[PDB]
């Protein structure tokens, strides 16, 4: 959408959620909500309206990969862009994510410039 595309930031670390929240505000994206794990994220996603999901890979209860796989299998939100936030770039993890449907991955920490690039690449490789 425009700057009003509604984001769901998912991370069990509240500090990270605020960090991502503020990097998006700096870019002009003010419509952000948060979730603390995969289950909490699915519960909010069921309300619809969401346009992008930024999710941490390691979370207790339902990690980012399981949250991704579930999103993709849901007919109503199977096209939802999902950006995976990780702490290290391991080959097998990047491929497991990619083959499961991840729109992209970003290694933390990252700046607003890095996030903007990752967002832009996801939009064009999709048609936005």
From Swiss-Prot:
Result of changing residue 12 to A: No effect on magnesium binding
Keywords in alphabetical order: Acetylation, Chemotaxis, Cytoplasm, Flagellar rotation, Magnesium, Metal-binding, Phosphoprotein, Two-component regulatory system
Xref: InterPro entries: CheY-like_superfamily, Sig_transdc_resp-reg_receiver, ST_Response_Regulator
Positions of post-translational N6-acetyllysine modification: 91, 108
Effect of residue 11 to A: Abolishes magnesium binding
Domain Response regulatory span(s) in chain numbering: 6-123
Keyword check for Phosphoprotein: yes
Consequence when changing residue 105 to W: Impairs chemotaxis
Record: residues binding Mg(2+): 11-12, 56, 58
One MF annotation (Gene Ontology) recorded for this entry: magnesium ion binding
Listed Gene3D superfamilies: 3.40.50.2300
Swiss-Prot/TrEMBL GO biological process terms: aerotaxis; bacterial-type flagellum-dependent swimming motility; chemotaxis; internal peptidyl-lysine acetylation; phosphorelay signal transduction system; regulation of bacterial-type flagellum-dependent cell motility; regulation of chemotaxis; signal transduction
Lineage: superkingdom: Bacteria
CC annotations in GO: bacterial-type flagellum; bacterial-type flagellum basal body, C ring; bacterial-type flagellum rotor complex; cytoplasm; cytosol
Tagged with keyword Oxidoreductase: no
PTM sites of type 4-aspartylphosphate: 56
Stored Pfam families: Response_reg
Cell location: Cytoplasm
Cofactor dependence: Mg(2+)
Cofactor descriptive note: Binds 1 Mg(2+) ion per subunit.
NCBIfam families per record: PRK10610.1
Subunit structure: Interacts (phosphorylated CheY) with CheZ (via C-terminus).
Function: Involved in the transmission of sensory signals from the chemoreceptors to the flagellar motors. In its active (phosphorylated or acetylated) form, CheY exhibits enhanced binding to a switch component, FliM, at the flagellar motor which induces a change from counterclockwise to clockwise flagellar rotation. Overexpression of CheY in association with MotA and MotB improves motility of a ycgR disruption, suggesting there is an interaction (direct or indirect) between the c-di-GMP-binding flagellar brake protein and the flagellar stator.
The protein, known as: Chemotaxis protein CheY
